[PDB]
Structure formats: C-alpha cells, structure tokens
Amino acid sequence: EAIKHLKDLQHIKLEGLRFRIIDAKGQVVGRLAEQISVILQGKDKPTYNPTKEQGDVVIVVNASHVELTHDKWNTKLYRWHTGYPGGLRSRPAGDQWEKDPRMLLRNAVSGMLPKNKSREARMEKLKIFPEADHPFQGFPLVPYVPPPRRLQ
RNA sequence: AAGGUAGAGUCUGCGUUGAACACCAGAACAUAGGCUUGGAAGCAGCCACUGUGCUUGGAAAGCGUAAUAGCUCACUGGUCUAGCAGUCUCCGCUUAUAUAUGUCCGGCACUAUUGCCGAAGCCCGCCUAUGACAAAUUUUUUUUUUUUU
Ligand SMILES: [Mg+2]
Ligand SMILES: [Mg+2]
Ligand SMILES: [Mg+2]
C-alpha cells in the first residue's frame, strides 16, 4: 500500500461536494447500493437540478463484510460478451469475490444509476475499500449511517 | 400428470399396560403339503391353505444354488424412551432434452374501500373561433289658412 495510498489521492472529479463515509459491516449489497445510488445522484439535496451533475464523494469501507442472502453466492452470475464468436463469459458470485471482492457493490451501484453519459463521473465518486481504512484520513468527511435495519 | 418441495386451515389407523423406522432378533413339527420333471425340498407351470405348542412364524416379498442350504424379509417379548403418521385444501417457487450469434423478472436488486405519485381526463388563470342569454326613468323641437282681373 506504498503507492495505493498515493494514487487514490489523485482526484479527477469536481470537488465542491461533500465526502461521505459508510461502514458496510452487515449491510446487504442491494439496499446499500440503493442508498449509495441516491447519495451519488445528488437527490438528497434541495438544490437538485437534473442537468447539473452534483453529488457526493461516497467512500465505502469494509467491502468484505457484505453478504448475499439466499444462496446468491453460488447461483448469482455476472455475464458479459467479448464481441467474438462464442464470447459469452459468466462468472459466479463466489468467483467474483475471489477475483475482485469490491466488484459486487460496484456492479450493484452501476446497475442503479441513470444510463447516460454522466455515469462515468458518478462512478468515479464511488470509492470502495475492502478493509477498514481509507486514504482519506485527514479529509473532512461526514458519515452516512443507514436507517436502522430492523423493519423486520 | 409427478417427487420426503416447503407455510397454513379439521376429524382420526399409531402410541408413556414401553411406541413406525433405529437395537438383541424367537423365527418352527409330521414334511420334501398334491401332479409333472433327473431334482420341485417356503416359491418353473399349477392345485391346496390339514392341525400343532403359539407372546410370536405368511405355505412364505426374496440374492441364491440340481435343491436342500449358504442367508434372511414379514409376524413378536424387552432396548431406545416422546417419539407421532396419511387420509382432505391452497399457495411462493419446481420437474418433464436444442431461447442451436449473446443473458428471456425490462435491467439492477430483494429470503390501505386512499395517505401520496400519476394523463392532453377534471378544476383554475389568460387567449381564440362560433353560437345563445343578459345587460346597454321628458315626451314636444316652431315653418302659415291667403292673393292679382
Ligand atoms: Mg377535479
Ligand atoms: Mg379541462
Ligand atoms: Mg366571443
């Protein structure tokens, strides 16, 4: 992590926004992805404009405390094509965790954003970290705790 | 149509006088019950279903042998000891072989007789065209019958 703490501090995006930190301990990937999508679009702001791309810098820690309920570790797949004949590639969720474990929440947030050309800028602002610390230690960052889970 | 697919709605064959499965297993005599066949010995084809001491043992579901047997299932005392079925009814997902370029819930995801959103409907403001209906208390305002031989 000698240079990984350096590269994540290199910012391409606009920075008039607010930084958010979310602990993903015990959170279901779908509901956390819904809340992260709402924060990323900037619709938690009274000054929201559909044309203007505001939002928040969402930082997620503990990406491997994230669970997939009802045997979706072996049955949920991730499929794409290569453009070549026979190019269907389907990866299971356990193999997706064993390849890159932050991609579960990454793809879940990607499927919930609006499908336009502002999606690249919104997916920049989602920074998902597997372990419990992030490079933005000294930053002024405001925590987003979700509403309590016990509706059931 | 089909499987120990599950969640719920009633009477009941079981069953705390030792219980389905799980455990020690008693598991038989005149006999090899009567025809055939070389042998038909609990059972190739078939006919019979005599008794017996019985808490139990079917002429007997069977691997099986020239067949007895090598083994046992079913029927019953106790062990385990609170176990406990299969008859009726739906439901959220299933099974029945080519989506044969590349995913078939739209994707991502998830194990309310009314509050709100929601249309060019309806109401409100303004405008246009064509139709109707409504509205918009002092009359009189002067001017001629005639005349000249
Ligand atoms: Mg109305
Ligand atoms: Mg109207
Ligand atoms: Mg008019």
Short mmCIF file of C-alpha atoms (C1' of nucleotides) and ligand atoms in Angstrom, two decimals:
data_model
loop_
_atom_site.label_atom_id
_atom_site.label_comp_id
_atom_site.label_asym_id
_atom_site.label_seq_id
_atom_site.Cartn_x
_atom_site.Cartn_y
_atom_site.Cartn_z
CA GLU A 1 0.00 0.00 0.00
CA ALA A 2 3.02 2.23 -0.57
CA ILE A 3 1.64 3.74 -3.78
CA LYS A 4 -2.03 2.76 -3.46
CA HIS A 5 -2.47 5.35 -0.72
CA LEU A 6 -0.92 7.87 -3.15
CA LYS A 7 -2.91 7.09 -6.29
CA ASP A 8 -6.32 7.25 -4.59
CA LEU A 9 -5.49 10.82 -3.52
CA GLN A 10 -5.18 11.88 -7.18
CA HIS A 11 -8.54 13.47 -8.00
CA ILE A 12 -10.03 13.78 -11.48
CA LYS A 13 -13.53 14.94 -10.39
CA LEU A 14 -15.02 18.22 -9.23
CA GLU A 15 -14.52 18.90 -5.55
CA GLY A 16 -17.18 21.35 -4.43
CA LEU A 17 -19.08 18.44 -2.89
CA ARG A 18 -19.22 16.66 0.48
CA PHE A 19 -17.33 13.48 1.38
CA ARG A 20 -19.32 10.58 2.82
CA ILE A 21 -18.08 7.51 4.68
CA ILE A 22 -20.26 4.40 5.01
CA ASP A 23 -19.44 1.32 7.07
CA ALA A 24 -20.60 -1.69 5.04
CA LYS A 25 -20.48 -4.04 8.05
CA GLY A 26 -23.50 -6.33 7.95
CA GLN A 27 -25.26 -4.40 5.19
CA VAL A 28 -26.98 -6.21 2.34
CA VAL A 29 -25.43 -5.24 -1.02
CA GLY A 30 -28.75 -4.33 -2.66
CA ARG A 31 -30.00 -1.92 -0.01
CA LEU A 32 -26.58 -0.35 0.46
CA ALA A 33 -26.34 0.03 -3.32
CA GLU A 34 -29.75 1.74 -3.36
CA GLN A 35 -28.66 4.24 -0.70
CA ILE A 36 -25.27 4.81 -2.37
CA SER A 37 -27.07 5.47 -5.67
CA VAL A 38 -29.33 8.05 -4.01
CA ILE A 39 -26.30 9.80 -2.46
CA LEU A 40 -24.35 9.63 -5.74
CA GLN A 41 -27.05 11.24 -7.87
CA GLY A 42 -27.30 14.25 -5.56
CA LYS A 43 -31.03 13.82 -4.91
CA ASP A 44 -30.56 14.24 -1.15
CA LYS A 45 -30.07 17.96 -1.86
CA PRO A 46 -32.85 20.58 -2.11
CA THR A 47 -30.88 22.35 -4.86
CA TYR A 48 -31.00 19.33 -7.17
CA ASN A 49 -31.05 20.01 -10.91
CA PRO A 50 -31.33 17.10 -13.39
CA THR A 51 -28.99 18.82 -15.84
CA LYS A 52 -26.28 19.74 -13.32
CA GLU A 53 -24.11 16.88 -12.08
CA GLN A 54 -23.69 17.39 -8.36
CA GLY A 55 -23.38 14.57 -5.87
CA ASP A 56 -21.16 13.35 -3.08
CA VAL A 57 -17.83 11.53 -2.81
CA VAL A 58 -19.01 8.20 -1.41
CA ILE A 59 -16.33 6.23 0.44
CA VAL A 60 -17.29 2.69 1.46
CA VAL A 61 -15.21 0.69 3.93
CA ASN A 62 -15.46 -2.99 4.91
CA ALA A 63 -16.45 -4.23 1.46
CA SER A 64 -15.86 -7.85 2.54
CA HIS A 65 -18.36 -7.64 5.41
CA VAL A 66 -21.02 -7.66 2.66
CA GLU A 67 -23.22 -10.74 2.28
CA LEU A 68 -25.51 -12.14 -0.42
CA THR A 69 -28.66 -13.66 1.06
CA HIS A 70 -30.34 -16.92 -0.06
CA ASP A 71 -27.58 -18.89 -1.89
CA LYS A 72 -26.71 -15.99 -4.30
CA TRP A 73 -23.02 -16.73 -3.69
CA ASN A 74 -23.23 -19.80 -5.95
CA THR A 75 -26.29 -19.02 -8.10
CA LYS A 76 -25.94 -15.31 -8.92
CA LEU A 77 -23.85 -14.82 -12.06
CA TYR A 78 -22.12 -11.93 -13.82
CA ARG A 79 -22.37 -12.16 -17.60
CA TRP A 80 -20.87 -10.15 -20.46
CA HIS A 81 -19.72 -10.62 -24.04
CA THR A 82 -16.42 -10.08 -25.83
CA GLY A 83 -17.55 -9.35 -29.40
CA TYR A 84 -16.01 -12.61 -30.66
CA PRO A 85 -17.84 -15.81 -31.73
CA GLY A 86 -18.69 -17.79 -28.62
CA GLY A 87 -17.78 -14.91 -26.33
CA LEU A 88 -20.27 -15.44 -23.52
CA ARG A 89 -18.41 -15.17 -20.20
CA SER A 90 -20.36 -15.83 -16.99
CA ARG A 91 -18.68 -15.61 -13.58
CA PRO A 92 -20.32 -16.80 -10.32
CA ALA A 93 -20.52 -14.58 -7.24
CA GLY A 94 -18.01 -16.64 -5.27
CA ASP A 95 -15.58 -16.45 -8.18
CA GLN A 96 -16.37 -12.73 -8.46
CA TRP A 97 -15.38 -12.34 -4.80
CA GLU A 98 -12.25 -14.44 -5.38
CA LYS A 99 -11.30 -12.26 -8.38
CA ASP A 100 -12.11 -8.77 -7.08
CA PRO A 101 -14.28 -8.60 -3.94
CA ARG A 102 -15.34 -4.95 -4.25
CA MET A 103 -16.94 -5.56 -7.65
CA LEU A 104 -20.19 -6.89 -6.14
CA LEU A 105 -21.13 -3.49 -4.72
CA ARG A 106 -19.53 -1.81 -7.75
CA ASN A 107 -21.78 -3.62 -10.25
CA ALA A 108 -24.80 -3.25 -7.95
CA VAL A 109 -24.37 0.53 -7.90
CA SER A 110 -23.64 0.54 -11.66
CA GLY A 111 -26.98 -1.10 -12.41
CA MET A 112 -28.91 1.51 -10.40
CA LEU A 113 -27.51 4.76 -11.83
CA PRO A 114 -29.16 6.50 -14.80
CA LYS A 115 -27.90 5.15 -18.11
CA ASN A 116 -26.45 8.28 -19.67
CA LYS A 117 -23.03 9.84 -20.29
CA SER A 118 -22.88 11.29 -16.77
CA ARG A 119 -22.48 7.78 -15.33
CA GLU A 120 -18.67 7.78 -15.64
CA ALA A 121 -18.40 10.87 -13.44
CA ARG A 122 -20.79 9.40 -10.88
CA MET A 123 -18.90 6.10 -10.83
CA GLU A 124 -15.67 7.96 -10.23
CA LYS A 125 -17.12 9.30 -6.97
CA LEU A 126 -17.75 5.78 -5.61
CA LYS A 127 -14.58 4.52 -3.92
CA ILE A 128 -15.00 1.08 -2.37
CA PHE A 129 -12.39 -0.26 0.05
CA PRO A 130 -12.14 -3.89 1.20
CA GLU A 131 -10.57 -3.39 4.62
CA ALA A 132 -11.42 -0.93 7.40
CA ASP A 133 -9.23 2.07 6.49
CA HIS A 134 -9.18 4.55 3.62
CA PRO A 135 -6.55 7.01 2.33
CA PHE A 136 -8.82 9.98 3.17
CA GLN A 137 -7.97 10.08 6.86
CA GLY A 138 -7.43 13.82 7.30
CA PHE A 139 -10.25 14.80 4.96
CA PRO A 140 -13.41 16.40 6.38
CA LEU A 141 -15.82 13.54 5.74
CA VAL A 142 -19.36 13.23 7.09
CA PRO A 143 -20.63 9.71 7.90
CA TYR A 144 -23.78 8.28 6.34
CA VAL A 145 -25.18 5.70 8.72
CA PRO A 146 -28.18 4.00 7.07
CA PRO A 147 -31.60 3.95 8.72
CA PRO A 148 -31.92 1.03 11.17
CA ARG A 149 -32.20 -2.40 9.62
CA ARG A 150 -34.97 -3.77 11.86
CA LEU A 151 -38.01 -3.06 9.77
CA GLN A 152 -38.31 -6.84 10.08
"C1'" A B 1 -49.90 -35.56 -14.75
"C1'" A B 2 -45.31 -36.20 -10.91
"C1'" G B 3 -41.28 -36.38 -6.10
"C1'" G B 4 -39.72 -36.85 1.82
"C1'" U B 5 -40.52 -29.24 -2.32
"C1'" A B 6 -41.96 -26.47 1.92
"C1'" G B 7 -46.04 -22.40 5.22
"C1'" A B 8 -51.07 -22.72 6.91
"C1'" G B 9 -56.61 -24.38 7.68
"C1'" U B 10 -60.40 -30.07 10.52
"C1'" C B 11 -61.77 -35.46 12.32
"C1'" U B 12 -58.71 -39.52 13.20
"C1'" G B 13 -55.14 -46.28 11.96
"C1'" C B 14 -50.15 -45.26 15.83
"C1'" G B 15 -48.94 -44.55 20.67
"C1'" U B 16 -45.85 -43.39 28.48
"C1'" U B 17 -50.26 -51.50 30.21
"C1'" G B 18 -42.57 -49.48 26.86
"C1'" A B 19 -44.13 -46.57 20.60
"C1'" A B 20 -43.32 -46.76 12.74
"C1'" C B 21 -38.01 -46.58 11.44
"C1'" A B 22 -33.15 -47.10 14.82
"C1'" C B 23 -31.34 -52.25 18.93
"C1'" C B 24 -30.87 -58.43 20.80
"C1'" A B 25 -33.64 -60.69 16.95
"C1'" G B 26 -37.54 -66.39 18.65
"C1'" A B 27 -38.42 -67.01 13.70
"C1'" A B 28 -40.88 -73.84 13.85
"C1'" C B 29 -43.12 -80.35 13.56
"C1'" A B 30 -45.40 -84.80 10.98
"C1'" U B 31 -42.84 -82.68 5.71
"C1'" A B 32 -39.58 -82.60 0.98
"C1'" G B 33 -48.07 -80.10 1.84
"C1'" G B 34 -50.58 -82.85 -4.05
"C1'" C B 35 -49.40 -83.70 -10.33
"C1'" U B 36 -45.06 -83.45 -13.60
"C1'" U B 37 -39.71 -83.38 -14.09
"C1'" G B 38 -33.45 -86.03 -13.04
"C1'" G B 39 -34.45 -82.90 -8.72
"C1'" A B 40 -39.69 -79.01 -7.46
"C1'" A B 41 -37.10 -79.58 -0.77
"C1'" G B 42 -41.14 -71.94 1.74
"C1'" C B 43 -41.82 -70.19 -4.21
"C1'" A B 44 -40.53 -73.17 -13.36
"C1'" G B 45 -46.48 -74.12 -14.75
"C1'" C B 46 -50.49 -75.42 -11.34
"C1'" C B 47 -53.95 -77.38 -7.11
"C1'" A B 48 -54.40 -76.84 -1.85
"C1'" C B 49 -54.39 -73.38 2.58
"C1'" U B 50 -54.85 -80.09 7.41
"C1'" G B 51 -53.65 -79.50 12.57
"C1'" U B 52 -49.88 -78.21 16.30
"C1'" G B 53 -47.36 -75.83 21.37
"C1'" C B 54 -48.37 -70.20 19.98
"C1'" U B 55 -46.24 -63.62 23.22
"C1'" U B 56 -44.80 -64.78 18.01
"C1'" G B 57 -43.62 -67.94 12.49
"C1'" G B 58 -47.05 -65.88 5.82
"C1'" A B 59 -47.19 -72.18 2.62
"C1'" A B 60 -43.93 -67.54 2.71
"C1'" A B 61 -41.86 -60.43 -0.72
"C1'" G B 62 -36.86 -62.58 -1.67
"C1'" C B 63 -29.77 -62.68 -3.55
"C1'" G B 64 -29.43 -67.69 -4.28
"C1'" U B 65 -27.99 -72.91 -5.65
"C1'" A B 66 -29.52 -80.00 -9.21
"C1'" A B 67 -32.32 -78.10 -4.38
"C1'" U B 68 -31.91 -78.83 0.48
"C1'" A B 69 -28.81 -74.98 2.14
"C1'" G B 70 -25.27 -70.71 2.25
"C1'" C B 71 -28.74 -66.15 4.15
"C1'" U B 72 -32.88 -63.68 5.63
"C1'" C B 73 -37.82 -60.25 4.85
"C1'" A B 74 -42.75 -60.37 7.07
"C1'" C B 75 -45.22 -61.63 12.11
"C1'" U B 76 -43.47 -60.69 18.18
"C1'" G B 77 -41.08 -60.05 24.23
"C1'" G B 78 -37.91 -56.44 26.06
"C1'" U B 79 -33.79 -51.54 24.43
"C1'" C B 80 -34.04 -46.54 22.89
"C1'" U B 81 -37.97 -43.82 25.66
"C1'" A B 82 -41.53 -38.97 23.47
"C1'" G B 83 -41.39 -40.13 19.69
"C1'" C B 84 -46.17 -39.20 16.22
"C1'" A B 85 -48.47 -40.53 10.64
"C1'" G B 86 -51.76 -40.29 5.84
"C1'" U B 87 -56.12 -39.96 4.86
"C1'" C B 88 -58.80 -33.75 2.78
"C1'" U B 89 -57.31 -27.93 0.87
"C1'" C B 90 -54.44 -24.00 -1.36
"C1'" C B 91 -50.14 -21.42 -2.23
"C1'" G B 92 -44.21 -18.53 -3.12
"C1'" C B 93 -41.06 -21.43 -6.08
"C1'" U B 94 -40.40 -26.85 -9.44
"C1'" U B 95 -39.99 -31.46 -12.93
"C1'" A B 96 -40.86 -33.35 -17.98
"C1'" U B 97 -33.64 -32.76 -23.64
"C1'" A B 98 -31.76 -27.51 -28.72
"C1'" U B 99 -34.08 -19.28 -26.21
"C1'" A B 100 -28.96 -24.08 -31.63
"C1'" U B 101 -24.97 -15.33 -32.99
"C1'" G B 102 -25.22 -13.43 -26.71
"C1'" U B 103 -28.38 -13.46 -20.59
"C1'" C B 104 -35.84 -14.15 -21.69
"C1'" C B 105 -38.22 -10.97 -13.72
"C1'" G B 106 -37.43 -4.68 -18.75
"C1'" G B 107 -32.41 -4.41 -16.02
"C1'" C B 108 -30.09 -3.68 -11.15
"C1'" A B 109 -31.66 -5.88 -6.87
"C1'" C B 110 -34.84 -8.04 -2.95
"C1'" U B 111 -35.50 -14.96 1.53
"C1'" A B 112 -54.78 0.66 2.80
"C1'" U B 113 -62.61 0.94 0.15
"C1'" U B 114 -56.98 6.36 -0.01
"C1'" G B 115 -52.01 8.78 2.54
"C1'" C B 116 -49.18 10.29 -1.75
"C1'" C B 117 -47.38 9.97 -7.16
"C1'" G B 118 -49.70 9.61 -11.69
"C1'" A B 119 -52.80 11.63 -18.37
"C1'" A B 120 -53.55 16.36 -23.31
"C1'" G B 121 -59.31 13.43 -18.05
"C1'" C B 122 -61.47 17.33 -14.43
"C1'" C B 123 -60.90 22.18 -11.89
"C1'" C B 124 -58.09 27.31 -12.06
"C1'" G B 125 -55.65 31.84 -14.82
"C1'" C B 126 -55.27 34.03 -19.72
"C1'" C B 127 -56.35 33.84 -25.18
"C1'" U B 128 -59.06 32.37 -29.97
"C1'" A B 129 -63.43 30.93 -33.09
"C1'" U B 130 -68.75 30.10 -33.45
"C1'" G B 131 -73.40 30.29 -31.05
"C1'" A B 132 -77.07 31.66 -27.29
"C1'" C B 133 -78.70 34.69 -22.76
"C1'" A B 134 -78.21 39.02 -20.34
"C1'" A B 135 -77.44 43.99 -19.81
"C1'" A B 136 -76.92 48.67 -22.60
"C1'" U B 137 -86.50 56.69 -15.87
"C1'" U B 138 -89.29 64.01 -20.69
"C1'" U B 139 -92.33 63.41 -24.37
"C1'" U B 140 -92.59 68.16 -27.61
"C1'" U B 141 -88.38 70.57 -31.08
"C1'" U B 142 -91.84 76.40 -34.02
"C1'" U B 143 -92.13 76.77 -40.91
"C1'" U B 144 -98.75 79.80 -42.15
"C1'" U B 145 -105.48 79.49 -43.56
"C1'" U B 146 -104.30 83.58 -48.33
"C1'" U B 147 -103.51 86.50 -53.20
"C1'" U B 148 -103.72 89.64 -58.85
"C1'" U B 149 -108.79 90.67 -63.26
MG MG C 1 -61.43 17.65 -10.05
MG MG C 2 -60.33 20.64 -18.52
MG MG C 3 -66.72 35.73 -28.48
#
